[PDB]
Every structure is written in structure tokens, then in C-alpha cells.
Amino acid sequence: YRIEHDTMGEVRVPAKALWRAQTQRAVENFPISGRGLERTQIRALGLLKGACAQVNSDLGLLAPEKADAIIAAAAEIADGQHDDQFPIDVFQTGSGTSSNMNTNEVIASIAAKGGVTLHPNDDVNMSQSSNDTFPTATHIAATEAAVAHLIPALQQLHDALAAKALDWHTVVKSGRTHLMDAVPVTLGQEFSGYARQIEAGIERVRACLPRLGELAIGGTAVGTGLNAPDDFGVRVVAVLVAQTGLSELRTAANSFEAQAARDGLVEASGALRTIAVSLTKIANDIRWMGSGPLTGLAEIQLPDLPGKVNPVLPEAVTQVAAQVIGNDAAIAWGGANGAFELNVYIPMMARNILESFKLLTNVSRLFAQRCIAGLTANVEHLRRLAESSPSIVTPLNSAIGYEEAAAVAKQALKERKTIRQTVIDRGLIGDRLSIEDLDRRLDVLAMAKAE
Amino acid sequence: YRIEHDTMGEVRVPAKALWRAQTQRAVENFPISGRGLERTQIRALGLLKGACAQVNSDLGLLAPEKADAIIAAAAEIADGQHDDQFPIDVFQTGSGTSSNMNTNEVIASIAAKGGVTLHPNDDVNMSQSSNDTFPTATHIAATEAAVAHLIPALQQLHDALAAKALDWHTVVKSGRTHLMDAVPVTLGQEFSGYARQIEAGIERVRACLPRLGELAIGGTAVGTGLNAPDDFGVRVVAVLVAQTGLSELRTAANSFEAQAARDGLVEASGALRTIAVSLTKIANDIRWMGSGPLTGLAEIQLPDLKVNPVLPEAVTQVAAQVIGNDAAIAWGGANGAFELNVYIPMMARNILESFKLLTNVSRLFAQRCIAGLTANVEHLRRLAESSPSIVTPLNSAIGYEEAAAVAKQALKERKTIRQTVIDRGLIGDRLSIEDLDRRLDVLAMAKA
Amino acid sequence: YRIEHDTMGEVRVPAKALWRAQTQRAVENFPISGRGLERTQIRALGLLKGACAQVNSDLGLLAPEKADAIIAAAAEIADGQHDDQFPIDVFQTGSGTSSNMNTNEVIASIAAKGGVTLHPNDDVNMSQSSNDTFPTATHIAATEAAVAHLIPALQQLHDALAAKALDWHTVVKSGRTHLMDAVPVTLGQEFSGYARQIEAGIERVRACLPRLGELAIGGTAVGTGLNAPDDFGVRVVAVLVAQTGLSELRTAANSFEAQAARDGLVEASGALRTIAVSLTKIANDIRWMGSGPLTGLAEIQLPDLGKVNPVLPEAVTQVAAQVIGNDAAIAWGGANGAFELNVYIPMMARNILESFKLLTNVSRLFAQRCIAGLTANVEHLRRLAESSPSIVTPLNSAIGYEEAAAVAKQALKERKTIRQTVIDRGLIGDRLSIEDLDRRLDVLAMAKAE
Amino acid sequence: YRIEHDTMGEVRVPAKALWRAQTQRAVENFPISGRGLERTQIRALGLLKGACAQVNSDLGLLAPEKADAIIAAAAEIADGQHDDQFPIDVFQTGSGTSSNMNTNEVIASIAAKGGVTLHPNDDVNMSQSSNDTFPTATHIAATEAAVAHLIPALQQLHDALAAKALDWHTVVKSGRTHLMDAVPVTLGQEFSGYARQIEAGIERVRACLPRLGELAIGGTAVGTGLNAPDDFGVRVVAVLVAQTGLSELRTAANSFEAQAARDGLVEASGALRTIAVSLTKIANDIRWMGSGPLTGLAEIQLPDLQPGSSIMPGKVNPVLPEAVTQVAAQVIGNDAAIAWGGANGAFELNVYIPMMARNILESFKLLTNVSRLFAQRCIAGLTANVEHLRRLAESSPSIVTPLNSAIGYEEAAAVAKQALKERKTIRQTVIDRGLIGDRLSIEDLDRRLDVLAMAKAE
Ligand SMILES: COc1ccc(S(=O)(=O)N2CCCCCC2)cc1NC(=O)Cc1ccnc2ccccc12
Ligand SMILES: COc1ccc(S(=O)(=O)N2CCCCCC2)cc1NC(=O)Cc1ccnc2ccccc12
Ligand SMILES: [Mg+2]
């Protein structure tokens, strides 16, 4: 160990650690979860520190030689070379002060290995506060997770569902309402519904981006911008947009709202919770369709990871959706509980919304590639059941009457025969209608209004 | 106390009741909450039945005499004349078929008084099913609630907050972070933040309208449109848009999605929940600002309705209810199966209540709390003059290094920056008292 | 349309209204939900005001003619004769002070009709504050809801599920795990599980009562009991227990915890939420078992209210969703108390009391009109169990796992029993007798029922 | 690296890995969260497999050389020696069968290093199925977390709050209702309330243990106990209780309920959620009481734990109350995910177990750790601003009521108005209006305005 210091005095730190006294106090203050910042959060903090140093350089506030050392150390952090140098718990001071200092101290220690002396606060934290930096890094990470990762994953799941919709366009089967047999549909129509739910999900994520991408940077301690250049925010956002290509990043509409609240994360979590609700419906329908092989619905076979495969990716999708619903409740609870100039639930809210992005992204790709793409339908079986259902006798009423239609339905179920065969067996052809009329009235694919 | 005849027996119905046997059976089946449809839901069922009869008449499927009687009866229901004729519990068959049949039977009874015989199913339910009607009426009610009621109420609250942000632009006070003393802000700056939260709320509601306004009508039992005209949904939506003025109403993008799921209600509830989160922070700050007046912050005075912050308490209680209703909505939303989501009556109750509560409490908060707030300007300035100061605004006068030495000694000796500058003998040609006092001015430090 | 004069001007009160000026101001201040107190709330406020007057009379603080007039008026409220005289929104001042004043005013007006002048504050609110009354009434209502109504309704459901468990003791059927076919169970064993879930639900409600029944009465404004007799709480609780028979009512263990927090409501909501979770699983299994009549599981038929929609499982799952939502609202109000008072009580009271009511009513309906009348497709269930690949494992020791796999594949392809498939493949002989085959494929023995 | 062979082909496994082909397939199948089982779950799986080997050896079903090798390997897992050998995602097959197989394979690999050959399924999984094991380990872990860790951590916080209640027995201050000035209380009475909340929290956790401690072991695939000895569950429970001292572990009341549902976890999460609600109120009151030091309430001072800002150098923040309120928010989220999974079981099996286990065990860990830190690093070192608190109580309009019987309610209200206008004590305002006369001596005023007596401290 080695001795390091802060406005509170002297602290023993691991001899080899790149962090300093404030990070070490945080390590001892918050042994709560045993988990620290994720890769995406560290990347975002590195991106922001490099952008701040660039702007401080461009305004002549920071010596070119200091700004270059910060930019080089922050690039190393952003690329993942120092992840083991971020040991602070998620459950830390609610501004994320502790992780901001962690980034500053690590950058100063990297710079010192290259013979440049940087102060963690005076130079690395120049024109910045914890109050504006940790929420900015959080919104960068969330905007990147939405745009670069979740929307493409959802687009892959949409396309896999839409491909099934087309492949199964004529795969007629009984409709089910209240779990009870109903008039015919096609598997393709049901898959077109699932596809729409995922396309609407993408629309919900895109709708939240104008507020999710709002950055607090430039507001400093309380939103007033004191101790920062009047244009710090716009210059830093411009640098981040050029480095990331995330045109969704923008300066906050109101600098006070951007620090006093995290309502953009709450809004975005609502979109993710809606996607979780959609995925639960899609996954539950698929596992029920694949149920059996004898005593279940036996409509489709899921690919193995026969018709005896356990629906393991529907189970992973429904467990992920439950987690997103829980995370969403935690996010809203933190979002509501800000006071005055600062919401002090940022580390917990960041943990939850970034996890929800990650789980939905990863499970959506797995579901698309390793379940949806490989589903096979019991086509002839589905059609036979549709042709054997009491639900399709209604179009006979005007020819044979209500009472005889009911007797046809009862006999078809009892003898396990089609409606067409039961109408013929009861001797109804000729007096009431012809074979041509029967085949028109009982065409289950036409009843599904597909071609 | 009349008697009616039904397939499994005789049904006893109150005499002034316009509902018939199916509704009476549902009354006996579901004695669960003792609460039925709200006025907004009844209105939407009447609007939908009038529009369907208008379209069936236009397509020549329904005789003009019968269509005119349904249209006139449906206009009375939509105008709130029959809010006592819908006795069925909210906790009913999950398609809302019971309430659909309730509407059909009340229209048939109204028409019989004007001397026309309508069959509840074959005439009033023509081209409709037991499954595309109640979700359509729900989305009509929810879209009307959002566009005609909630957004204007939020705009009233935004405008009241923004008016305070301007009045109090220069009312300097201490900033608080972590509940601890921080650098100065103005009361107007804080109110500008509240106003932005409500403006963003209006943006959040507007963003959900493309999906909230999707109607299932025309998809019939399973979404295929079997037993409806091919253009039923588009024609009914046009009639509803023309009669309501709600341009946000639209046909569903996908008729299967629109019946298998109620994702548009889950999305909209998310927007309402975000507004509840915003309102909680605004209401909590206002009650804390009004706290005391000896033991608290005593920053503002709330209008009296020692004043208890009763409208902040109503707002925070409403926000808790919207958070709970939002969890019920999502639970129902997730649990659809195959062609139909059977949680619609419960989802409808919860989202329509969340819209009503937010609309009503926002207008009350705006008119009876925000508009009448008074700032304790002298107290607030005394708090600003007790905030921490910084040395930066002295840099040009004493240089980076003396400033850093003022900062160090102020921290070590627990002194203000001002007193530390004086005690270090720095008042001279480089820095007068005037220049010290102008550089450290608390309203200047707030950067208004 | 009669007129009344307040401390702040003129107020019009409906003519047949028994409330007075302070209630009418609250009607004007809080037009939010359009829903006021439920009947259980109103009853409890009446019970509490009767007991307080009884105690104030016993201690010589209140003239007996006034106490008798309050006691008779509060009894009419407790009996549900004045449920239309409580017009204040649920979304009111968060102590419930407005509904407290509503009760005081209605009692004074009832007494006035009998010739007795009561001051709503000085007489009807004597020894009480604006902060210990409404939460006491809420805990009286919730405790009565739990003991008198929800536990008996859950016991009815338990007894119905248990009756079916016994009736279906030998009704063998395929088991399902992950929705896939598994080794045999009986419908009776599955119903015994549902019954246990409801019996555990009753245990959960019973376990919260020590804290649900704690009353704040006697704590006054901040919990110190200032301006009330030192023994007011134990006296009033004793009167409530003697009059109602609700032995679970008790004074609070800590008078400050009893007003600063509503943690007993949050605790009880958690028990109701667990019951909602259990009922969701029971109702979802029952509607799936009744799915069909052709393309579904077709294990059982639900009674009409093979083609009946499962309307009472839909009512039960909708109620469960409501109870989940209500539970989130309760916890949110619970967490947000400050210092000496939690000011979310009206909202918490609405949610907890609704959850009790919905679970009570739907549990009795589900027991009587769904569970009691279920019918099993007994021979169909046994045939499927006897035709499942899941039951070939007991053949392995006689014919080998490779030939057992061949039997399973052919039985499924030809829609035949495993037994018929073994005979059709000519496996009966010295390696396996017909009696040995019947013993190995005894699906009811595989279910291991009592 | 080192290759292996599965029923579906050839699997590459890391060289130092003790897991085998099935675990490697599960690693490839579920790259979802990148987080696997926690040490408490790994320990419970080890405890369970050792107990099962003990019982199978006792019934004569498993050869003693094989049982001893399983017991020795299972004790290494339960002792935390192999926490890097469980790489499968939380978000796996919903029975937890993948993690069950992980345990079997790791035990077989540990046994191989000692020259004993164990079949992961036929030996390490003997009398067990893919469905009664993981929920049993979950309930063992949750019961151990409740009894051995959470209840003691909550007792430490209770004792710290109760010690402050005693120290501040006479520290009078104004009460606050609706955030407005109220009649007097003592800081000790308020802390007595906080202590009761935590004591009630312990009562809520004990009240769930009769059902949290119920184990599914013995029920096999569907709860019937097919392919297990009839008394397997009681035998394994007897061994676990004897070895761990966890008296709360029991065989399920109904073997179907214990596999079809995870209602015991939903119940337990409700207790943890109630504790989170109580902790939120306590932590929020404490940070408000410590607010300022010049623009807030300044009722107490919290011990300084780290620099709070560089822009405002001496500013120190209520970081432990913030950690507590963030933990509480996490527990309320976790609680909603647990109830969602609990509700969604079907027929003989609830297939949300790995997700419910992650959430319930994290809630226990966060509450345990943050309770201890809050007791030791915040509550124990609080100091009260006694003279500030008393000054405000003695200046409160709320204390004029006891003057009514001497000078009348109208004159008392006049004293209140003047005192609040002129920033004086009530006592001084009474003197400054010349009311000391025939119905009120100076000692009689001091008796009526005794603010500590008005608080009515026991
Ligand atoms: C809901 O599942 C069902 C519903 C009804 C009926 S029925 O009796 O009314 N009937 C109609 C179909 C024609 C043959 C005679 C049986 C059967 C079934 N299931 C099956 O056939 C199960 C099944 C067994 C074997 N191979 C299969 C291959 C693919 C799919 C399912 C398979
Ligand atoms: C999951 O539902 C199934 C699963 C498998 C099979 S099977 O093809 O493998 N099969 C085995 C049963 C023996 C004759 C038919 C062949 C059928 C079925 N459903 C049915 O029989 C549907 C059915 C039709 C008519 N009457 C019924 C009366 C009660 C219940 C269900 C009925
Ligand atoms: Mg003060």
C-alpha cells in the first residue's frame, strides 16, 4: 500500500492501483452489492472526459500538453484497458461523485506514467461537476444502447417474425379467443401481429430519443453553469456527436430539469417495459404452440438446444421481461425522489436502465436466430383441426338451419371427423346444398380472409 | 320488476332499466367491485354504436329506419343521458363482451320507445363481434382523455409554472444538492425546471398518440374481419373522426396486433407514469419550500384552502395511484393469449382513471396552489448570502495562485471567501471592497 | 339547497345533506376522482367515534346525554345507514382530517334531529386529533376485512379445491413441465397443490394480523398523546374489542411508529399480493385445462355462466392484476412519510380496502360457480397418459432403452397406447409377460397417490 | 483449452474449467446478462449435493467410495473454493436444470482429480431430477440469508437506533406534521419509532420463515417422487438441518405446491419490500434532519465519510442515507420481478426460478450490507444540535395551549402571534405583555410552558 490525500486527510491505497484517495474511501464506504460500473458506463465516462479536455484545450483554458495526456488516457479508458481500475459499488453517493473521481484519478495516474502531471480535479475535472458529468455519461451510455444495439436487435427480431408471416401466409389453423376454439386464422397472420408488436417497440424507442439524448454537461453544480464556459455544453456535445456518430446526443432544453430530474431515463424505461410486455405475449404464444408432443397444442416444433424440445428461449425471454419490469419499477422510484437542484438516485437508475437495454438486446437476437428462424409448422395437422372445428359450421346455418348445424358440430367432434365429412355422412347434400356450395361455405383459408 | 325470457330461464329486470336479460345475467355473474363503467367509457360505446349503424346504413346492410333509431339512441348515450343503464361490474368477461351487449340492449330499449324494433345482436351489433367493440371504445375514450382533457390541463400547469419562472427570475436563493447548502440559484430557475418537466410530459403524451389512437373495429372475432365489410374499419373511423373532431383516431396498422394485444394502453400508461414521477418531484419541492414556518425552510407561502400543503399532498397521492394503476395495466398487457387479450375491462378502468386523476389534479394544482404562491424574497436572499462562494470570480484581480491560497485558507479556517480575502489583507489597488462585492454578488453567481 | 356560514364566508349545502361547512369546503377543494370512502371505511369511522364517546363518558370528560347522542348516531353510521353522507374525494388532505371532520359533522347533524346540540370538534372529536383518527379507522376496517370476510372466503375456496382433490384422487393424467409432456400425475394431486396455495394464503393473512390490528388512537397530533387521557388508547381499544369481537385490534407497540408510518398496511398488502399471485396460477391452469373443445387441452369442462368461455378465471386474473397494482400504490405511499406523520393514508386506505374486497368477492364466486362444478374428461386423460412417450422408461429393464425409444416413436405416430404398441411390435413373451407389461405401464401407480 | 464430446458433437472447454460439455453448451446458449450464480447459490447447491449423496449412501443406493468423493467435492463447493466454476447465465432454462448439471459436472471433475469416476447424472444426480434441485438450493440460500445474515444485520441497526433513542430521551424539539410546525416531541421518541420499524421488520422476516424454509427435494420431476425413495426429502432435510443448524429448513407441506409455485419467495420478497419502505422513511428523515448546515433543518450532524464536492470544498453529503434509499429502490424493483415470475408458473413447474432466485438473494444481500453500514457508519456517530432544537420548541406557537386555563385562548393566541412576529420565546412574550399577576406566577408559567413535559416522555 501507499499513502494518498484529499480535503479530509490521509488514506492507504493498494500500492499498484491506478485510483487514489477518493476512490479508496468509496471502496471502504460502499461494500454493498460487490458490483461496479459496467463496460458501457466506463466507456461513456472515458468519452466524456476526452471531449471535456478537447473543449477546455480549444478555449485555451487547459495547456495543450495536459489536454493531450487527458485525451490519450481517456481513449485507453473508453477502449476497456482499465476496467479493473473502477472498483466502486453501484450503490454509492447518489450523484455518482465517487465514479466521476474514479475516472479523474485513473486518468491522472495514466498521464503520470507518460511523465505528465495532471491534477484529478483542477485539470481532469476542469469546467465540470459530478452533478453534470455522471448523468451525462449515463445518458450517453443509454442513447448508445438504444441506437447502436437495441434498435438493430429488435429490427433482426422483426425481420425473423415478418419472414415467418410470409412463409406461413396460407398455414390455416383454428383461431383461439379466451383459449377457446374460434374461427380460422393463419399462422402467418398471427406472426404478422408479433412482427407489428416489435415494429411498434422500435417506434416507442425512437419516440423517447429526443429526451433520452439530452445531456446535462455545462450545468455544473446546480444547473447554472457557474465555473464553466457559457458554451461548454454545446461544444462538448458537438465533440461527442463527431466521435460517436450519435446525432441523437444534444444539449438539455433546460439545464435545471437536466440535473434536478432523470425523467428521460424513466420515459425510456417505459418503452423498454412495453417491449418486455410484447415479448412476453410473443414468447408465451410460441411455447404454447410448441407444447406436447402428445398432450399439448402441437401446432409447431421449436428447434432443439423431435417436438420434445423444452422451450428454453421462450423461458429466457419471459425471465428477461420479468427483470425489465422490476428494473422499470426501481427506475421510476428513483426518478420521483429528487430534491431541489439534484436527483441523487443516478447510479441505481443507470444500473437498471443499462441492464434492461442489454438484456433486451441480447435476448432479442438469440430469440430471432435460435428460435424464430428454425420454427416448423405442423401444416396438415393445423388445417385438419381447422376443418374439424364446430366454429366453422355457422356459414351452413342459412342452408341446413341452426338445429342441424349444431347436430353436425356435435357429430364431427364425437367422431373426430371434418365438418365437410360430417355434412356428407348426415345425408345433407342435395336437399339443402350441393358439394360446390359446401366447399365454398367451408373453405377455411377463405374464412381466414387469406389467399 | 318485469320478467324476461332467456334460453336457460326467466330473468327479473328492474322496471325503469333499459338493459335486458344479457345485462341482468352479467349483473348476477360478477358482483365483485360494485363499480361499473365510467361516463367516458359509456360515451365511447355510444359513439361507436352510432358510427357502426351509420356505416351499415351507407353500405345498404341495415334499413334506414333501423339505422336512424340506433343513431338517435347512440347520440343520447354519447351525450350522457343513460349513465345509469350500465350496471355491469368492471370485473367481467375479459373481452368486455358483457358491456358490449349492455350497449346493444339499452339502444334496443330506447328505439322501442320511439316505436322501432331492433334486435340487439343482428341490428345494433351488425358487422361487429364480441371482441373488436370494447377495445375500440376503450381506445376512443383514452384518446379523447389524452387530447381533449389531459394535454390542456398540463398546458394550464406549464403556463402557471412558467409565469412563476418569469416573476421570480431575480429572486436569488441558496441552491441545495443532496439537501446540503450549495451555490446560489434563483427561484425562477427552479420553476423553469418544473415548467420544462410538464412541457416534456406534454411531449410524452403527444408521442404515444399514433398508437393510442389505433382502433380494432372491423377486425371482428379474431382480427380477420370475417362477417364485416372489407372497408368497415376505415369507414367507421372516418365517421368517428368527423363526429368527435379527434384526428388522432386511426385504423390499426395490424388487425391481429390490435386484438391480441393492448400495447398502446401500456405505452400510454408509461407516459402518465412519467408525468406522475415529474409531479411528485415538483409537489415535494413546493411543500418543502412552504415548510415551517419556524421549523422548516419557509421559502414560499402556499395559498390557504400555518397552512398545510393540501394540494401537494393530493398531487403526490394521485401520483402514487397512477404508479399502481400503471403496474396493473402492464400486468394485463403481458397476459394476452393467441387472438385476444382478455384483460381489457381492467386495463380500461386503470388507464382511464389515471388520465382523469392527472387531468383534475393538474388543473387544481395550477389554479389553487401554483398561481397563488408568494416568495419570501428577503428570507431567500439571506439564504443565498449564506451559500458557499467560490474564488474563480477573483482570478482576474489576484491571479490563479492567490485565489488558490484564499480557497485553501477559507477551507482550513472555516471562513467565507469574502472574510478570507479581507483577513489576508488583499483589499488594495488590485481589488477594492466594491470590486470584491461585485465579483462575489450572489445574484451574479446564479448567472440568471 | 340550504345555506351555512363558515369561518371564511357563505357555503351552500344540499338540503338532505347531514354534513356541514367543513365537508362542503372539502367537496369544493378536491374534485379529483369523483370516488369517496367505501362502506367499510365509513363503518369504521362510526365504530371509532362511538367508542371514543363511550370512553370520554366513562372518564367523566363528556356529559352522558351528549355521549348517548354520539353513540346512537355513530351506531347508525356503523350500520351503513349514512353511506351517502360521505362525499369527500379519496384524494384529500393526506392525514384524512377532511373525512374525520365529515364524520364529526354528520354525527352532530344526526344528534340535532333528536334535540341534542353537539359541537363537532369539541364534543365528537374530544380527546382525538386530526391525525390519529383516520389511520385508526383504516386499520379497524382492514383488520375486519381480513378476519371477518377475506379469511372465510379463502377458506370456502380452499374447501372447494380440497373437495375436487378428493373427488379426482384417481384421475390419472399426463404431467406437464415447461408445457411439455412429463410423467403421470392425478388431477387430484394438482388440486391438492392449489388447495395448499390457498391454505398458505390464509396463513399469510393470519401472520400479518399482529401488526395490521395496531391502532394509533390516543397518540393525538404527533404520537405523544398530548391533549388526550393517558389511557385513552387502551380504553378505546378495549371498547372496540368488546363491541366488535375483533380480538386482533390492539394499541400500537410504539405510538410514534403508528403515526409516522403505515408499514402494517404495506405488510398486509404484501400478503394480498401473494394471494393474487397464487390465484393467477390456479385460474390460468384451470382455463388452460378447459381449453377447446377440439384444439385445446380438453382436460376438464367448466360450468356455463366444452364451449363455455372461462369467464370466472378471467375475473380472477383481472382482480389479481388490480391487487398487484394497488399493492404498488400502497408501498409508494408507505415509503413517503415524513417525521411525525405519513400523509398518504386516504390513498393507502382506498387501495388496501379495495384489494380485500375484490379478493373476498372473487374467491367466493370462483369457489361456488367455477370450482364446485368442474367436470373431468376422465377416460380421455387416462388414454393420453397411457399413450405418452414419457412412460416407456419402466420398459428399459425388460427390452432396452433402444427398443423402448422405438415403441415411443411408433405409439405417437399411430396414435396408440404404449401397451398396444408393445403388443403390436410382438414384444410379449419370455422377456415380458402381459402382466409384467401392465405392472410396468400402470400410470396411476406411477403418479404415487395415497 | 481442451476438447470434449457431447450427444450433439465436439465441445471446446477452457483447460482450468471443472465444468464439462453440458455447462459449455449452456454458456454458448445463454449469452444474455454475463452474470451467473452468486456465491450463496453455489454454496447451497454444494450443500444440497453432499446431503443427497449422504442419503443415497445411507439407503444403500450409492457405493460408499462414490458418496465420500461427492461429499468431499460438495464440501469444497459449499466452502466457496469453486466460485469461478459456474459460468452459466442467470437467464437460463427456467427450472435451473443447466446450473444443476453444472454442479454435477464440477463435482465429477473434482472427484476425477482423486481417481474416482462419478457419472454426473447417474451418481451425483441420483434420486434427484432436473426440477426439485435448483428450487431446493434457492430456498436453502434464501433461508440462510434471512436467518444467518439479514436478521443479525437488522438487529444491529435496531440496537443502534434504540441506543440513540435512549441518549436523546430528553432532547426536546418541535414535531412536524405535513412538514409544518407541530407540538413538541423528543428526538429520542422519533428514534424509538425508527427502532420499532426495524424490530417489526425482523418480525416480518421470522413470520415468512415457516414457508420460505420449505424444500421441494424428493418430489422429482413433477412432485410425485417417482424415481426417488419415499422418505428422500425428510432424510435430506435431516442431514441439512444437522450440518447447517438451519432449523427453519423443512420438507414441503405439499410436494405439488413446492414445484408448481415459488409462493414462498414472493412472500419473503414482500417482507424485504416492507423493510425497504421502512428504511426509506428512516433514511429520508435522517438526511432531512442533517440538512444544511445553514439553509436546511440542521437538527443533527452526520459523521463525515468522504469529500462531497470540489466546487464547494468543505461540503459533506448524507452518502449513507443515499446508499440506503437507492438500495430500497432496488429491492422494490426486485420485488416486482419476483411477483411477476411467481404468478406465471404452469401445471407442475414454475419456470422463473433462476430469475426469482437472482432477485430474492440480491435483495437479502443489499439489505444486509447496507443495514450494517448504516448502523455503524451513520447512526452510531450522529450528534444532536440540542440547543437549536430546544430554542425552536420554546418559540413555537404550538405550546401556548397550556396557558388557556390561566389567561384564556384569545390572549394565548395573541402571545403566539406576537412571539412569531418578534422572533421571541413564548415565555418572554408572556412576560412582555404583563400577564404575570393573580392567575399566573413566574414558576406557574415555567410549569405550563415546560416543553419536555409536553413531549410526555415515559
Ligand atoms: C390439440 O391436439 C389435438 C386435437 C384434436 C385431435 S383429434 O383427436 O380431434 N384428431 C384430429 C386430427 C386427425 C387425427 C385424429 C385425431 C388430436 C390432437 N392432437 C394430436 O393429433 C397429437 C398428435 C399425435 C401424433 N402425431 C401428431 C403429429 C402432429 C401433431 C399432433 C400429433
Ligand atoms: C390435446 O388433445 C389431444 C391429444 C392427443 C390426441 S390423439 O390424436 O393422440 N388421440 C389420443 C386419444 C384417443 C383417440 C384420438 C387420438 C387427441 C387429443 N384431443 C382430442 O381427442 C380432442 C377430442 C375430440 C373429441 N372428443 C373429445 C372428448 C374429450 C376430450 C377431447 C376430445
Ligand atoms: Mg431552521
Residue of D nearest to C448 (CA): D224
Which grid coordinates are listed for A226? 457557474
Peptide bond into B293 cis (omega under 30): yes
Cell 484529499 sits at which residue? A6
B122 in a labelled binding site: yes
C-alpha dihedral, D424 to D427 to D432 to D434, nearest 10°: 160
**Out of B180, B182, B291, whose CB is closest to D179?**
B291
Tell me whether residues B181 and D294 touch, CB distance under 8 A: yes
Element (H, E) at D319: helix D319-343
Whole-number Å distance between alpha carbons of C269 and C252: 19
- Residue-wise over B327-366: b if at least 16 C-beta within 10 A, else e? bbbbbbbbbbbbbbbbbbbbbbbbbbbbbbbbbbbbbbbb
Q: Sign of dihedral through CA atoms A255, A257, A258, A260?
A: positive
Tell me the resolution in Å.
Answer: 1.4
User: What is the crossing angle of helices D319-343 and A346-370, to 10°?
Assistant: 30
Within 10 angstroms of residue D447's Cβ, the number of other Cβ atoms is 10
Whole-number Å distance between alpha carbons of D72 and D95: 26
In sequence order, what are the beta bridge partners of B394? none
**Out of B308, B321, B328, whose CB is closest to C322?**
B328
B247: region left, alpha or beta (phi > 0 left; psi from -120 to 50 alpha): alpha
User: Among D174, D177, D190, which would you mutate to test the C interface (most chain C Cβ atoms within 10 Å of its Cβ)?
Assistant: D177
B121 in a labelled binding site: yes
Which grid coordinates are listed for C382? 387416462
Element (H, E) at A306: none
The amino acid at C135: P
The amino acid at B246: L
Element (H, E) at D6: strand D2-6
D346 contacts in chain C (CB < 8 Å)? 176, 179, 281, 284-285, 288
Q: How far is the CA of D198 from the centre of ligand 2 (A)?
A: 57
Ligand closest to the CA atom of residue A414: 2
> Hey, whose CA ends up nearest to atom 23 of ligand 2?
C294
Residues in Cβ contact with A374 at an 8 Å cutoff, skipping those fewer than 6 apart: A302, A303
User: What is the crossing angle of helices A187-212 and A263-289, to 10°?
Assistant: 170
Which grid coordinates are listed for B225? 374481419
Which grid coordinates are listed for A129? 461537476
Residue of B nearest to A197 (CA): B257
Closest by CA position to A426, among listed A446, A403, A392: A403
Tell me whether residues D91 and A323 touch, CB distance under 8 A: yes
Contact D254, D291 (CB under 8 A): no
Tell me the count of B-D CB pairs closer than 8 A.
101
Long-range contact set of residues C157-160: C-beta below 8 Å, sequence gap at least 24? C157/C198, C157/C363, C157/C364, C157/C366, C157/C367, C157/C371, C158/C195, C158/C198, C158/C199, C158/C202, C159/C367, C160/C367, C160/C368, C160/C371, C160/C372
Q: C412 CB under 6 A from ligand 2?
A: no
Whole-number Å distance between alpha carbons of C213 and C234: 13
Tell which residues of chain A come right before a gap with C–N over 2.5 A: 305
Within 10 angstroms of residue B1's Cβ, the number of other Cβ atoms is 7
Residues in Cβ contact with B317 at an 8 Å cutoff, skipping those fewer than 6 apart: C90, C91, C94, C333, C344, C346, C347
Contact A164, A191 (CB under 8 A): yes
Q: How far is the CA of B50 from the centre of ligand 2 (A)?
A: 45
Instruction: Give catalytic residues of D, as residue numbers.
Output: 178, 309
Tell me whether residues A329 and D336 touch, CB distance under 8 A: yes
> Which DSSP letter does residue B169 get?
T
Contact C151, C202 (CB under 8 A): yes
Cell 411531449 sits at which residue? B203
Q: A179 CB under 6 A from ligand 2?
A: no
Contact C3, C90 (CB under 8 A): no
The amino acid at D41: Q
Contact C138, C265 (CB under 8 A): yes
Closest by CA position to B289, among listed B389, B178, B191: B191
Element (H, E) at A412: helix A402-415
A416 CA: nearest ligand 1 atom: 9
Element (H, E) at D237: helix D232-244
Task: Delineate the domains of chain D, giving CATH numbers in brackets.
Answer: 2-128 (1.10.275.10), 129-398 (1.20.200.10), 399-454 (1.10.40.30)
- Tell me if residue A169 is catalytic: no
Catalytic residue among C82, C158, C178, C380: C178
Residue A271, CA atoms < 13 Å, CB-side half-sphere: 30
Closest by CA position to D232, among listed D54, D41, D46, D45: D54
The amino acid at D106: V
Q: C179 CB under 6 A from ligand 2?
A: no
In sequence order, what are the beta bridge partners of D322? none
Ligand 1 neighbours by CB, cut-off 6 Å: A 294, 297-298, 378, 381, 384-385, 388, 416; C 294-295, 412, 415
Residues in Cβ contact with D217 at an 8 Å cutoff, skipping those fewer than 6 apart: D48, D52, D128, D132, D133, D136, D232, D233, D236, D237, D251
Task: Name the maximum alpha-carbon separation found in chain A.
Answer: 104
Tell me whether residues C278 and D261 touch, CB distance under 8 A: yes
Q: How was this structure determined?
A: X-ray
Q: C383 CB under 6 A from ligand 2?
A: yes
**Out of B320, B342, B346, whose CB is closest to C344?**
B320
Q: C297 CB under 6 A from ligand 2?
A: yes
Cell 417497440 sits at which residue? A201
**Out of D308, D336, D354, whose CB is closest to A319?**
D354
User: Among A22, A91, A226, A273, which would you mutate to test the D interface (most chain D Cβ atoms within 10 Å of its Cβ)?
Assistant: A91
Length of chain B measured in residues? 448
